């Protein structure tokens, strides 16, 4: 359900796994390498950000924008009003792109393997699956994330 406790747990684990400095770029590159290995076809949806070359400034800038979205969103997990306003802002940016909601399921799987892989053994997968649902639901609206 992603109650307040799980939200706190997830904020804590994200912070540790996200890190400082360039470790964030590394985290992001891992997250996106996993997304494209999980769903090789999702890569085509990003021609606008030059996904042909993942190490290109255009795509790296995209990686930065996404993990920055994850960061600000997770940081607002404790304030419903701020959280929902931002999730709608994100939805507005993703709708005109007509994206298959299933991709967001793959993204979450990648998010978990990346945060878990960095955080280590005490990673709380159930908490993350539940709270990630809130994000996905807030961005896509597809009740598949209900």
């Amino acid at each position: 359900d992603c109650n307040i406790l799980q939200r706190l747990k997830v904020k804590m684990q994200w912070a540790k796994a996200y890190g400082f400095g360039t470790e964030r770029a590394k985290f992001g590159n891992s997250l996106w390498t996993s997304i494209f290995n999980y769903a090789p076809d999702a890569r085509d949806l990003f021609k606008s950000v030059k996904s042909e070359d993942m190490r290109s400034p255009q795509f790296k800038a995209h990686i930065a924008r996404v993990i920055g979205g994850l960061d600000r969103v997770i940081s607002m997990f404790d304030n419903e009003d701020a959280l929902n306003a931002d999730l709608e802002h994100l939805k507005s940016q993703h709708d005109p792109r007509g994206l298959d909601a299933l991709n967001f399921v793959v993204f979450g799987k990648a998010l978990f393997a990346t945060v878990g892989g960095q955080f280590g053994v005490c990673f709380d997968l159930p908490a993350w699956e539940s709270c990630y649902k809130v994000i996905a639901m807030g961005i896509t609206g597809n009740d598949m994330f209900s």
Binding site: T33, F36, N37, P40, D53, M54, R55
Partner: protein
């Protein structure tokens, strides 16, 4: 350059490979190959015919299996030799003459299978780097298809 197969991409490819490579049993190799061909066939129906001698219609026959093991041995010999291009060149020529003058075997089919590997690898290999991989896979095929049609 720029899309050249660099020294680091080679180290990286040997890594992606050395990992999913079983040095003792054919189980892993075999599985990777068959899956690569299934994928190529499903994307290029007309291709199965080129493998009638090895029973390309029966991917699980002792004959096609032994063929997949040979293809995987060819790729393995080339991936290892990325570290010593002088000899690689000699090896890639020999392979070229082994694919040369065999109707259909054409560059187009190599680009196809290159896509098959890109779809198979990530499923079996951990920490797969598609960019580095293709840059060197291509370097390898280019030597294999020197004398062929588009």
């Amino acid at each position: 350059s720029s899309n050249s197969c660099t020294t680091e991409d080679r180290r990286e490819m040997q890594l992606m490979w050395a990992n999913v490579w079983s040095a003792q049993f054919t189980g892993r190799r075999l599985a990777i190959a068959q899956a690569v061909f299934k994928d190529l066939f499903a994307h290029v129906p007309d291709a199965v015919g080129l493998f009638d001698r090895v029973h390309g219609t029966e991917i699980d026959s002792s004959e096609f299996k032994a063929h997949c093991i040979r293809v995987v041995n060819g790729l393995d010999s080339a991936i290892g030799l990325l570290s010593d291009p002088s000899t690689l060149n000699e090896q890639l020529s020999h392979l070229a003459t082994q694919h040369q003058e065999r109707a259909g075997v054409t560059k187009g089919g190599f680009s196809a299978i290159a896509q098959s590997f890109l779809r198979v690898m990530p499923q079996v290999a951990s920490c797969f780097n598609p960019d580095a991989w293709s840059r060197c896979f291509n370097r390898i095929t280019n030597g294999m298809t020197e004398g062929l049609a588009e």
